Amino acid sequence: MKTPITEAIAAADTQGRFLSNTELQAVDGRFKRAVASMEAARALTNNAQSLIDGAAQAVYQKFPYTTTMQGSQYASTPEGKAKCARDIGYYLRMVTYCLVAGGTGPMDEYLIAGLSEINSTFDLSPSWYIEALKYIKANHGLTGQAAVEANAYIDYAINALS
């Protein structure tokens, strides 16, 4: 899983080398930044439900046809809304994992790999999940470097959908 530490180790184990000051500097940067990433992950976690419930409506307002059209890919049924809210939670939960781990690994492994195959097979439009990510990014209520960490991994998701 891609974290600052596994990259530092991977770079050394690749060249057959022991760790060096080159790699330890990289991990010291992780340990320092962790203070800002943690409080971002804590906040997103504590306000996770209001952010999911608001993100779902931001989508149903922007794309109202998803609540009226027929088809298992749409949120026009109570089961479809449950599925959508679930997926939005999945995205938010991966953002917290990325902050806790210090890198994209969690999202890379659990979400981004296979995204295009699934979104196509099940006729899910990426525009929907980007709108939900834009709503979280605007309303997570973070400030300073805690917000820089959150948006970094939210924009990373958005670029994966674009």
Binding site: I5, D28, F31, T45
Partner: protein
Amino acid sequence: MLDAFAKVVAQADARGEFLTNAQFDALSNLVKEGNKRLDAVNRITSNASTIVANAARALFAEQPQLIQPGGNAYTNRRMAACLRDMEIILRYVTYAILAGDSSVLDDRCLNGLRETYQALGTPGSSVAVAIQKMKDAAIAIANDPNGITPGDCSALMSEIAGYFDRAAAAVA
């Protein structure tokens, strides 16, 4: 490969849960102790060559049959292969000390290593002796109280000990 953070992540995903405070506090504490972990890794790495050499010199003093003709460490090709293994093991231990997790040590060094030493006929029990030779030397170096901000690294030095025993347990 997992580190102490990715491990906790992988365990939450399996249950589909966000992290709880019990885990945000454990991981925050890990960060609080990062400087100690880096001194330890730096100290062992900067004495890698002496650790392996003195450990090799002592192994062959106690078990002189490894180096007499017909011994598994006889000839320079098997001596070098032996010093190499000692260096490779110490190298994946220092990886685990930095990751706070033994996964890299298991997948990429220890896993399958017992089967290897039995195919070529190497005394794994002697390899195990070599591994705990480096352990005592590395802890001595890592926990040296001189030229470093005083503090308690006893918890860390115990974790480091676990990685060595894990390695010597997998070959013996």
